[PDB]
Each structure stands twice: as structure tokens, then as C-alpha cells.
């Protein structure tokens with residue numbers, strides 16, 4: 456599995472020494488550099504390959520400016536590097552339509568943004584070397600702003616990889632050591648497993664010794680009834696059957712809003728499939744390859760539900776509490792080394808065959824609940840009891856408690872940092888594409 460490109464595991468706040476944080480910060484930054492350096496021509500940075508996201512030049516500068524802005528806010532920095540750039544690159548976008556984004560969106564030169572990145576790197580490195588790391592770090596400690604910036608950089612490694620995937624292959628260059636998972640051919644039978652009901656506690660305590668975003672915190676007990684879930688995420692080969700049974704052409708599997716999305720975008724298959732010469736090819740990060748039939752299918756929420764509609768019989772997606780019960784049970788002390796047991800943290804540079812990582816079966820019997828691809832949940836993004844916005848970033852999650860965003864959990868092959876662990880709560884508009892799939896659920 457992928458070894459040459461290595462991502463350092465997250466660190467407990469009780470062990471966030473200066474030396475360990477230097478290593479984690481250096482690793483977070485060098486990883487993003489490797490991804491951004493995969494674009495061959497500078498002119499490509501002014502394309503926005505995802506029509507619902509900013510041009511690539513924005514994301515080249517956004518991670519660096521985020522660090523600077525948060526460090527200034529806690530007064531660990533007395534001035535920025537470029538106040539215009541810190542405004543321009545301050546916050547991203549989350550539009551419902553490409554027309555909204557186009558109306559909203561003069562960009563600087565690529566070389567100028569790279570120079571800003573390099574200056575910002577040296578400025579943060581000097582802050583780290585000149586600040587006392589009095590253990591333990593915590594949410595009211597000034598260094599929380601640094602913990603925030605590193606996790607924000609690592610999330611944008613994930614979200615930018617999806618933008619580069621939407622560029623033509625001729626515009627990107629695979630980094631040395633990038634390795635896709637193998638494919639074993641057709642997948643095994645995807646059996647439904649009974650998950651025994653139980654009570655779960657959602658949320659994270661304020662004094663938990665791990666960095667977290669504001670929406671992670673709170674406390675909610677939820678009694679979860681028993682339910683059936685497929686042992687594997689739905690595979691490309693399973694979704695091919697859906698296509699061959701006219702899944703995209705039957706309104707009864709969709710609803711008015713999702714059908715409208717499909718029609719307006721002329722969708723006939725998942726985004727990274729392409730039909731040519733009788734067969735589907737598949738677009739990995741940098742190459743088009745024969746469709747890996749045993750990999751989890753990558754779809755948006757509309758497509759996942761349309762598949763559930765074709766299955767019928769009340770087939771549905773899990774709730775947040777059901778996923779937590781299946782993944783972590785009713786008990787919990789996080790063990791960071793367990794990240795190595797799943798397709799997380801660049802173990803592979805792609806999704807893997809369901810069940811290939813033999814250490815990736817949860818105690819519930821379900822495979823790749825953690826890792827491989829994010830999995831969609833029928834759960835509107837919402838706060839847990841006790842939620843409180845952090846003063847450093849009050850708009851992080853509160854604007855998205857709008858019943859217009861569905862959640863996803865578990866992490867993907869590209870996921871790094873604290874986002875690979877138990878408490879991270881992820882959310883997207885249901886039409887949006889991520890490294891995300893789904894499994895199916897029935898009550899009986």
C-alpha cells in the first residue's frame with residue numbers, strides 16, 4: 456500500500472510538544488504542496504473545475520491565509536503578511552447553483568500566491584519555535600488557533616483533491632509514490648447484517664484531549680433500535696446493475712428535487728465514470744482506468760437515495776446515531792494508532808476493494824465504516840445539546856444548521872488529522888460530490 460507519501464498521525468493535546476507540533480505542521484504543509492504542485496500549467500489555477508467551488512488559485516492561498524488570520528485573532532501574531540490576500544482568501548463558498556457562484560466570483564498571479572505561501576510558512580514556523588508549548592493545550596489556550604489551522608489545511612487537502620480530480624488528466628501530473636489500491640475483480644456478495652440496538656452518546660466533552668471543531672461538542676443520548684445494514688459499502692459493480700436496470704431513467708426511484716438535478720446536469724452515471732467503446736472507464740485522481748468493480752461507488756446524496764429507491768422495501772440510509780452505534784458501539788478512549796487499521800490517512804491513494812483491508816471490520820461486522828470513502832447519512836446537519844461557537848471561528852457550522860445539508864461520517868482514504876477520529880462531524884449539500892459512498896439499511 457501507499458508508503459512513499461506519508462501523512463503523520465494526529466497528536467493528543469496532552470502530547471503537543473513543540474517538536475511534535477513542528478513535525479505535524481511541516482507534514483500538513485508539505486502534503487498540500489505536493490498536491491498543488493501536481494498542476495502542470497499555471498493557467499490551470501484560474502479554472503474552477505467544480506462549478507460549485509472557487510477557482511484553484513483561491514485554494515492555493517486559502518489554507519495559508521487561514522493560519523495567519525486565526526493566529527492574528529489570538530494575538531500570537533502582531534501583523535499579517537498581505538492584508539489584501541488575507542481578505543481575498545479569507546472564506547470559501549457553498550452555493551446551491553453554479554449561477555449563484557458565477558455572479559459572486561481579479562485574482563493574483565500564481566507565482567505571487569506561491570510566494571505568499573512560502574512567507575506564511577516561515578512566519579508560522581517562527582511562531583512555533585518562539586512560543587512555549589505548556590502542556591496540555593486546550594480550547595482556551597492561544598495555540599488552539601494553530602491546531603485549528605493545521606486541521607483546516609488537512610481538510611482542504613481532501614477538498615482540493617476533488618477539484619484536481621475534475622481537471623482533465625493531461626493537466627495534472629501524478630506525484631512520485633502515489634499508489635492506487637488494486638482491484639480483485641467482481642465484489643463478494645453484499646450481505647445484510649443485523650446491528651443490535653443500543654444506546655449511544657453523541658458528542659465530545661469540552662475537556663477531551665483532542666482538537667475538535669465546534670459542531671463536534673455537546674452531549675446527546677440516543678436509543679437506537681436494531682437495524683439491518685449491508686456489510687459492504689455499495690460497490691461500483693452493484694451500482695452498474697442499478698444503471699443497467701434503467702435506474703437513472705425511472706422517476707419513481709427519484710423525487711422532484713433530485714430528478715431536477717439529474718436532468719439539469721444530464722447525468723446518466725456516477726460523476727467519475729465514462730462510457731467508451733462498450734465499457735465504462737473510471738477516473739482516479741490522475742488516471743483513467745477500467746472500472747474497479749469491487750471499489751465503493753462514489754455518488755452524491757441524490758444518487759444514493761435513487762439507488763435505495765430501486766432497492767425498494769423501505770431501503771434507506773443510516774442516521775448519525777445508527778452509524779455511531781455500528782462503528783463504536785455503546786461504550787470510549789480513542790486510540791490514534793487504530794487509524795492504521797482502515798483505509799485512512801493515505802494508506803492508499805484511492806478507494807480500496809470493500810473488505811481488502813482485513814483490519815477494517817468493525818465489531819458490528821460492518822466493513823469500512825471508518826475509511827475507504829465517507830458515507831452519506833440521512834441526517835440533516837444539526838447541533839448537539841451544549842453546542843457553542845468558538846470565538847476564533849463563530850461561523851464555522853452555525854450557518855449550516857439550515858436543513859439543506861446532509862451529513863457524512865467515517866473518513867475516506869484521503870482523510871487526515873483529527874478528521875480521521877471519532878468526533879469529527881462532516882456535512883455537504885446533497886448534490887455535491889466528495890470521496891463519498893454509502894451503504895444501505897432496512898428496519899426489517
Ligand SMILES: [Cl-]
Pocket residue numbers: 788789790791793877
Ligand atoms: Cl479509536
Ligand SMILES: [Fe+3]
Pocket residue numbers: 517546547607
Ligand atoms: Fe476553508
Ligand code: NA
Pocket residue numbers: 823824825826827828829830864865866
Ligand atoms: Na466509511
